[PDB]
Each structure stands twice: as C-alpha cells, then as structure tokens.
Amino acid sequence: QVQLVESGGGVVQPGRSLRLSCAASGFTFSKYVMHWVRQAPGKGLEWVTGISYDGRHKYYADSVKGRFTISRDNSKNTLYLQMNSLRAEDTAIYYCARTGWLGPFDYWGQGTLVTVSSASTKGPSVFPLAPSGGTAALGCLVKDYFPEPVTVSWNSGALTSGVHTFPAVLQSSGLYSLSSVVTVPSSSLGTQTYICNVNHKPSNTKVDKRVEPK
Amino acid sequence: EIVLTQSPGTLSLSPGERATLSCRQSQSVGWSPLAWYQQKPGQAPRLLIYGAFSRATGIPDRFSGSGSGTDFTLTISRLEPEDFAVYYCQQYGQSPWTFGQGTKVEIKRTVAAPSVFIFPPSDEQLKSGTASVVCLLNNFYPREAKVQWKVDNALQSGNSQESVTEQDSKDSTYSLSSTLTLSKADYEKHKVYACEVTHQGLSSPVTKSFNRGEC
Amino acid sequence: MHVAQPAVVLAGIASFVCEYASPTEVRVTVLRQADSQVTEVCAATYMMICTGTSSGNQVNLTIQGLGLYICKVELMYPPPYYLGIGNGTQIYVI
Known part of the structure; x- marks a missing residue:
C-alpha cells in the first residue's frame, strides 16, 4: 500500500x-x-x-x-x-x-x-440580497474576508432546498467574496422568515442576517 | 517542449453511454509514453492508462486507451456515475513533463433556461461607499451563458466577476452569479441597472433590471 | 527516444542488444514483466546476473541463471531527461 x-x-x-x-x-x-x-x-x-x-x-x-x-x-x-x-x-x-x-x-x-497573499485576517460584512413568477429569490452577499473559508446556512440548517452557495471569488483587493442564494415559492415570502447564518472561523465572525423582502 | 492538446473541452453524456476523449501531442517520440489521469472534484489525480493502452493497477475494464504517434484516445465504453470527472493526458517521455489542459465529462440533461434575478445593493452596503449589484442565473443547462451588465444602457466592462456552482447532484443544472461592483458615487450617478442574459434555453435574451430608488 | 530490442531470443544465458537514439550519463534497467507486475532484474549507470557493454548508442545485455524482459534506457544528464522503454524481449529457455 x-x-x-x-x-x-x-x-x-x-x-x-x-x-x-x-x-x-x-x-x-x-x-x-x-x-x-x-x-x-x-x-x-x-x-x-x-x-x-x-x-x-x-x-x-x-x-x-x-x-x-x-x-x-x-x-x-x-x-x-x-x-x-x-x-x-x-x-x-x-x-x-x-x-x-x-x-x-x-x-x-x-x-x-x-x-x-499579503492579506491579513478580516471578517466579512454580510448584506441582504432582497427579493416575478411563482418563484422568488433571495440571498446574502458575504463580502471582504480573508482567509477562506466562510460557511453559510439558512434558518440554522432547516432551509436546504434550492440553496446555492457560490464558490468564493478572489477580488482585486486580495479579499474574498461570495454569495449564497435560495429560491422559494413567491407565496412563502408572506409566512416565512429567511435568515442566513454566516461563519468565518478565522476571525471569530458569526453573523445571522435576516433577509427581508423589499 | 512537447505540448498536449485535448478535445473536446467538455463531453456531455449519460451513464451507460460511450465517452471518447482525444489528446494530440506536438511531436512524435518514436513510442507512446502517454498517460491518462482522472480527477474527481476535491480529489487528487489518479492514473488510468499508460503507454497509450496499458491499464494501471486496479483500473476497471471499461477504460481503454489507443493511438500512436501524435494522436491518442481514451475510451470509457459504458460510463458509470463515478466517471463524471476531469480527464488529463500527459507525456512522460522527456522533461519537462507536460499535461493536456483537461476534458470535463459532465452529465447531460435537457436544455433548461435560467431563471434570472437582479439584486440592488443594500442600503447598509452603500454606507461603506461601495455598491455591489448581483445577477443570479438559477438552475440552467448547458453551462455556457453570457451575462452582460448595462447601466443607463451603458454596457459595462471590467468591473464584474462571476462564480458558478458545480453541476447539481439532483437536477444536473448549473447556477451562476455575476457581481457588478461600483463606487457609491458612480452608482448614484445612474438610474436603470440591467442584467442581460443569453443562453441556449432562451429564444430571446432576457434582461432583468431595476431603477435605483424604487421598491 | 525510441528503444529497440529483439522481440524474441533463445537461451541458461541469453544476450540481446538494446539500441536507442540519444539526442552523457545513461541509466540502464532491465525489467521483467510477469502477469501485470514488473520486477527489476538489472540496473547500472554508465557515463560514455547481468553483463552490459556500451558500443555507441547501444548496450549489449547478457542475462544468465535462466518471459518478457523490458529494456529501459534513461538519459539523466545534461537535461532534458529522456526515457525510452523497449517493446520487450521474449527469451525462451528450454
């Protein structure tokens, strides 16, 4: 072997x-x-x-x-x-x-x-991606962090179905960014709250961002 | 310096179908020190074939190689689900040891147009002096797509980045995000922000847009 | 680099010539291929069981004490490294 x-x-x-x-x-x-x-x-x-x-x-x-x-x-x-x-x-x-x-x-x-990389440790800022057919889309933008990785869940793990967490991109700043999105029935926006749970262990950053339909 | 060129860039097949991958080298060597490697996502390469046609240890019968001179082929007779991966050829007859650029063998499915959504920058973000505008293409197939940003019909260039998921394990589609990054001052100079998408599943390219300051 | 060796030889001693097309340190290995496995019979480095003499771009390899015997030739230095592997020699001991 x-x-x-x-x-x-x-x-x-x-x-x-x-x-x-x-x-x-x-x-x-x-x-x-x-x-x-x-x-x-x-x-x-x-x-x-x-x-x-x-x-x-x-x-x-x-x-x-x-x-x-x-x-x-x-x-x-x-x-x-x-x-x-x-x-x-x-x-x-x-x-x-x-x-x-x-x-x-x-x-x-x-x-x-x-x-x-010449970058130093930095936690992300988390911004909402806020929501035309029967399906609606929302998400969280996880911006300006180093080093990788960040983890993202939705509603503490209870919402997995239609979630897409994109690979991170390395920006010209030397910091990473990624987005996580989820599609849901457009009707569900009136009965369900959507919270993205972001963790960046290298910076002890934990953010639970509620995404509110606009 | 021996250069290897693989074709096609992507093969789209279903389990049970035959995969034929090509590798052409820039000069013949008088013999065939030509190997094929498989690479599954997040995993190291694995030797499949060497000497153009010889199977490496433990490699299943369905993998075979052929060819001579400058022209080599890897055949997977009947694809299994674990065979959807990237495949590289390599010459090992002389330094520098060189590889082809790889061929992706992906799951084929029916064409599916993306659902497109556009997201304005959050007010929270604008306090930092930067506006990120996000365009989402959700659950489409095949992978090729064109995303063009327009701002007051001004076609944008150089200020966007894309990210793409790996093929979905349930429905075999792709999703893609394009993020347009502008300063707060540039964002507030303009009103209408448009994401224009061209894809195989779209008769007419779809444009999703918003006017700054409406909701 | 192509390496030529006889496809068949008859022997307890068997000798065969192994020829290569070199474009100063050469490494010669004889491998025995049994089933789908490979064993090393002989190895030596020359700088222009087994007996090896170098006459130009060829090596006269004599095996004794006697399958497919693969002749492997490597140009080690100066670079580039080159590897040549012969189609193999069948030796018949009877």
Whole structure:
C-alpha cells in the first residue's frame, strides 16, 4: 500500500519562502523518480519539478526555475520543495507524485495548499440580497474576508432546498467574496422568515442576517 | 517542449453511454509514453492508462486507451456515475513533463433556461461607499451563458466577476452569479441597472433590471 | 527516444542488444514483466546476473541463471531527461 502525504502548505506573504515535505511509505523510495505537480484554483495540472532516484539530478519547469528547489532524503524517505520568491500565481495545491518504473505518475498524494497573499485576517460584512413568477429569490452577499473559508446556512440548517452557495471569488483587493442564494415559492415570502447564518472561523465572525423582502 | 492538446473541452453524456476523449501531442517520440489521469472534484489525480493502452493497477475494464504517434484516445465504453470527472493526458517521455489542459465529462440533461434575478445593493452596503449589484442565473443547462451588465444602457466592462456552482447532484443544472461592483458615487450617478442574459434555453435574451430608488 | 530490442531470443544465458537514439550519463534497467507486475532484474549507470557493454548508442545485455524482459534506457544528464522503454524481449529457455 503506497502512501504519499504532503505537508507544509499555508498562507505565505509574497517574496517570502516556504518548505513543503512529502513523506513516502509502502515502497522503496530510493528506486523511483519523484515529482511535485501543482494545480492553481480552477486550473489544470502543471508539473513543477522532479528529482532522480539518488537525488543527484533535478529538473525544473521554467515557471519555477531559480525560485524553487527540489531535494530528497532517501533515509527519511521524504521529498522536499523549498519555495522562494513566492508570487501570487504560485497559489496552488501542491501534489507529491511517484514515477512508476515504466514512466507514468502512478501514485499521487492528496496535496497541500499554498496560498500566496499579503492579506491579513478580516471578517466579512454580510448584506441582504432582497427579493416575478411563482418563484422568488433571495440571498446574502458575504463580502471582504480573508482567509477562506466562510460557511453559510439558512434558518440554522432547516432551509436546504434550492440553496446555492457560490464558490468564493478572489477580488482585486486580495479579499474574498461570495454569495449564497435560495429560491422559494413567491407565496412563502408572506409566512416565512429567511435568515442566513454566516461563519468565518478565522476571525471569530458569526453573523445571522435576516433577509427581508423589499 | 512537447505540448498536449485535448478535445473536446467538455463531453456531455449519460451513464451507460460511450465517452471518447482525444489528446494530440506536438511531436512524435518514436513510442507512446502517454498517460491518462482522472480527477474527481476535491480529489487528487489518479492514473488510468499508460503507454497509450496499458491499464494501471486496479483500473476497471471499461477504460481503454489507443493511438500512436501524435494522436491518442481514451475510451470509457459504458460510463458509470463515478466517471463524471476531469480527464488529463500527459507525456512522460522527456522533461519537462507536460499535461493536456483537461476534458470535463459532465452529465447531460435537457436544455433548461435560467431563471434570472437582479439584486440592488443594500442600503447598509452603500454606507461603506461601495455598491455591489448581483445577477443570479438559477438552475440552467448547458453551462455556457453570457451575462452582460448595462447601466443607463451603458454596457459595462471590467468591473464584474462571476462564480458558478458545480453541476447539481439532483437536477444536473448549473447556477451562476455575476457581481457588478461600483463606487457609491458612480452608482448614484445612474438610474436603470440591467442584467442581460443569453443562453441556449432562451429564444430571446432576457434582461432583468431595476431603477435605483424604487421598491 | 525510441528503444529497440529483439522481440524474441533463445537461451541458461541469453544476450540481446538494446539500441536507442540519444539526442552523457545513461541509466540502464532491465525489467521483467510477469502477469501485470514488473520486477527489476538489472540496473547500472554508465557515463560514455547481468553483463552490459556500451558500443555507441547501444548496450549489449547478457542475462544468465535462466518471459518478457523490458529494456529501459534513461538519459539523466545534461537535461532534458529522456526515457525510452523497449517493446520487450521474449527469451525462451528450454
């Protein structure tokens, strides 16, 4: 049973440095080429760097050459990625991958997330999205928070049906925003109150915003 | 540097149907160090096929690969529900190791026009000096949609961001929000705010709008 | 890089030539493919059970003490790394 477990990801300020580790087990680590592969949010797979069996040969993508360094310790059976001169576009999930003896990447770790940001901790402000056919829509705008994530429920969890909580977007400010919406029978607006329950654990922000039809 | 190009960008199929995915590489290598990977949302990639046609360990029979030279194909003979995911090809014959841009295999369903709603900025928000205007396209299929903002019929550019849900696990639709961000001062210079939506399910593009200061 | 090896060889010793099209450090591996599994028979690095001699862009590989035997050649340095995997050699010991 092959296992690869990455660690070391987190929030890092631009220009600074971060070291990732990949702890391997279940195979003779020394007998395989190892790689780091990354995936930026919403994007595809990009090979970053690889290292030969013995650690003597290191190969790098142009996108990271001169900024990132790969190494391995064949006694600790660990792969390392030393990331320097970090940039916003280095924000990605970083996977450790083993090269099978016939060539393909035959085992992958679950990945560790690196977020490169100069932003500081901030809770969101929560604004109503207030409500033409038989269906009405309302929601909450969860604006200007860092880091991810925020959670959103409706009526403490009792309203789940027609709820859509969108993925967060990274704004040019460096803070995140998202919306959560729900569609309901337009008649239900006269008998039901709708409260969105927002939580941003990183800032101990808890907001229960009632959304009132206008 | 070997470049891989996949086609189509999205395949829309139902369980039990056949999936054919294409991958073209920019040069032949004299052999086929060509692999296919599956990636389910929130999960790491998983090797399916290597050497163009060889199945990785534990991979079911319904996955097969073919091709040679520059032209490779992944076939899923009869799709199972767990096969709706993104698929990447890769060449591993030389550094830099390179991937195709991926093919999404999504659940097909009948066309469904979005229900469109427009939301004015809250008064609470305007105290902060910023107006967020939100347009919601609810439960539509297929995923392609065009959202255009207009302000006093002035077509907007560069001041909006979109977010899209993943395919709904009950009804296989998508929903999308578009948020137009303006300063309070710009918002109050204008009266009519319009979200215009073009979609496969819409005979005529629908426009949803409000006049600032009405309710 | 394409790697050519004989499709069939008859043997307790069997020798076969493994040829590649290199575009200075080479790593040669012989893999035995049994069922859907792969074992390492032989490995060595040269810098221009088993006996390997390098004559140009080919290696003469002699196995002894005797399936599909896959010849694997890697250009390690200077970069790019190149991998070549032969179609495999069937050896008949009788």
